[PDB]
Design a protein around this nucleic acid. Sequence first.
DNA 1: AGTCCACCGGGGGACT
DNA 2: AGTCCCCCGGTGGACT
Lengths: 336, 333
Amino acid sequence: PFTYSIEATRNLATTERCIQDIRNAPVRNRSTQFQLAQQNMLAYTFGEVIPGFASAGINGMDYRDVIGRPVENAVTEGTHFFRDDFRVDSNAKAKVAGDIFEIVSSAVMWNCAARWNSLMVGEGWRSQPRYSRPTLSPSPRRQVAVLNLPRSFDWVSLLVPESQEVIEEFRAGLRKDGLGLPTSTPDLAVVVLPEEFQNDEMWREEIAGLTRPNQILLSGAYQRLQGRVQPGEISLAVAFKRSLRSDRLYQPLYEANVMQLLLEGKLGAPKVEFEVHTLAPEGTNAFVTYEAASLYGLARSAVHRAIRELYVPPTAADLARRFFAFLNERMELVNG
Amino acid sequence: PFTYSIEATRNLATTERCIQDIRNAPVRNRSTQFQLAQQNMLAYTFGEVIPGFASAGINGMDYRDVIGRPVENAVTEGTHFFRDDFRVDSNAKAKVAGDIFEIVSSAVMWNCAARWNSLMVGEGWRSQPRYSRPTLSPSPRRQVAVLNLPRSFDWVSLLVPESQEVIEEFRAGLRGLGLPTSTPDLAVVVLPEEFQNDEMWREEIAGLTRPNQILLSGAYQRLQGRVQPGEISLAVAFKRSLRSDRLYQPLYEANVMQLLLEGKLGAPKVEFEVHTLAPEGTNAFVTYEAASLYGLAEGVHRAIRELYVPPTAADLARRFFAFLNERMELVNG
DNA sequence: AGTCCACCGGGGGACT
DNA sequence: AGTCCCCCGGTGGACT
Ligand SMILES: [Mg+2]
Ligand SMILES: [Mg+2]
C-alpha cells in the first residue's frame, strides 16, 4: 500500500513483488542483480491511492515524498527479503523514479478530467475531495482526453488524415532536398475529446488507484484517439522531468518548436500550449531558459513562448487545482 | 603514463593521485567516498601523449579505448591503495569520461589548428606524424583558432560589438519573453587579424599537463569580443555516447545560432556537428537530418551538418584538416 | 565553505 | 531472445 506493510507483501505472488532477484537470470550484457518492478511498485504503493484524490493527509503531502514513496517501499522489501545481498544502482532508482513521476502525475490529470468531463456533460461537480467548481459554460463538446504518450510515440499520429497529409506533403518537399523534419512526442497530451466519444463513459470515471489493469487503461488511452484529433485540439502538451540538469532542458523545448511550426505554422492552429513539470529546478537557469520565444514565428505572426511555463507542484493537490484552472480557462474558445 | 606504470603511480605525490580518498573529508549532501582526479588522469595518462600526434600505436588505436584509458588507470590505482574499500559510482565515471572525451578531442583539434596555422603562415608543413599536406593556397589570413568552450559559456560573447549589438535591436524588441543563447562544446573561429602573428596559435603540445590543460581551456577569453559573424567556422558537440533524449541541446543551439548569424547578421550558413563514439540506436542519424527551422520561413539546409563517429584519433585529425582544406577557401588570401 | 554547470551510463518495459 | 526507447542523479571542477 502507500505505507509499507509486510502483510500485504506476504500475500504478494512472488511475481508481484517489487524487487526481482535475477542472480540466476542474468540480463544480456547487464550486471543487474535485482530489478525494480516499477509496474508492481505502482500497484503496491498506489493500488488505491491516486494522490490529489485521496486523504487530505496524502493530497497535501509534499509531492516529492509521494513520488518517491514507491522506491522507498521497494528498497524496504529488498532489504527485508535479501538483506545485504541486496544492491540496486542509482540509475535503476533514477529510471524508475522518473517514470513513476510521469505516470502518477498523468493519473492525477486523468481524474482531473474525469470530474471535469462529468460536470462538462450533465453531471455535477463531485464532492470530494473539495475543489473549486469551474465557472465556464458546460458542454459535452468541451470534455478532453488525457493521453500519457508512450516511448517512441509520434505526436503527429493523433491527427486526422487531412492534416497528416498536409504534413507528409511538406516533408516530401523537404525530402526532395536531403531534408527531414522528424517529429517525436511530449510525455503527455491533453486533447479535446473527439465528438464520437463524447457519449462514452470511460472518459468520465475517476479511478481508485494504479492497479495493473488501471495503469494499462491509461497507458493505452492514446490508441483510441489516434487519427481522430483536429490540429487545434491538441490543447496541452506536458513534459515530465523529476529533477533538472541544464542539458536536460532541450527535448521539450525543441519538440515544442517543431509542434508549433507544423500545427501553427502549416496548419494554422492557435498557439500551441506546451509546458514542463519538475520537482527540482536547481537554480533559476531552468526558468530563464524556457522564456525562449518560438522560432518559426520569428520570421508576420505574433510572438509567443515555446514553453508556456515551468511548473513545480508542491503537492498533488496543487497539480489538480492548477490543471482544473487551465481547463476552465483554455476551454473557452470552444463553442459547445 | 598512457600505460599504467606502478613506479610512476608511487612516484606520485598525493595531490597527484588519480583517486582521492575523502571518506574523512565529505561533500555537503554527498556520499562520494572516492573522488576522480580527472585533471590528474589527463596529466598521468596523457601528459606525454596527444593522440594522432604520438606514435602510430596510439594514433590508430581504437579511439574508444584511448578515451577509456585514464579511467582504466585510475581504477587500477584505486584498487592497489584501497583493496577492500575502493568504490566509485557509475555516474562518477560517466562524468569524467564524458569530459575527457571533450578535452582530448579538443586537444587533437588544437594541434591540428597548430600545424595548419604554421602551414598557412609560411612555415613548413610539419610531418610527425605524416598527414597529407593541404592543397589550399596558404595565407596568414586563413589561420583558425580552436576554442574549447567552458561550462556557462555564451557563444555570443565571441562576436564583435557591432554584431552583439544587432543581437539586441532585434532581441530588445522582444520582451515576459526573450531568447537566451548557450554554447557548443567547442568552436572553430577564423583567427582575427590582430593575432595572426602571435606564436601560441602554432605551437602544438606534447601532453595534457595541467599547464597544458589550462592553456586550451583558457583560450576562449583571448577571443571574446574579437570575432566576425562569418568567421565562426565550425561548432562541435561532444557526446561520448548517445541516448535518444540526450540529442536535443546541440540541435536547439544550432538552430538558434543559425537563426541569429544567418537571418539576423546575414552570415553564411553555420556548420554544426556532433561527435559521438556510441550511437546505439540509430534514431540519432535520422534525428540529425532536421531542416533548420529559421530557414523554413525564408529559402534551406540541415541544422546539424553531420553526426560523426571517429574510429581513431588519426581519423579525427584527417577529417578536420580536409574540413579546413575545403572551408578556408572562402577566406580571402 | 556554498552554488552553479553539463558530463552520461545503467537502467524496466514495449516490442519483435 | 534481441533491440530500442527515454528515464535522471551522482557526480569534478570553476566561481564566489
Ligand atoms: Mg520527460
Ligand atoms: Mg557534449
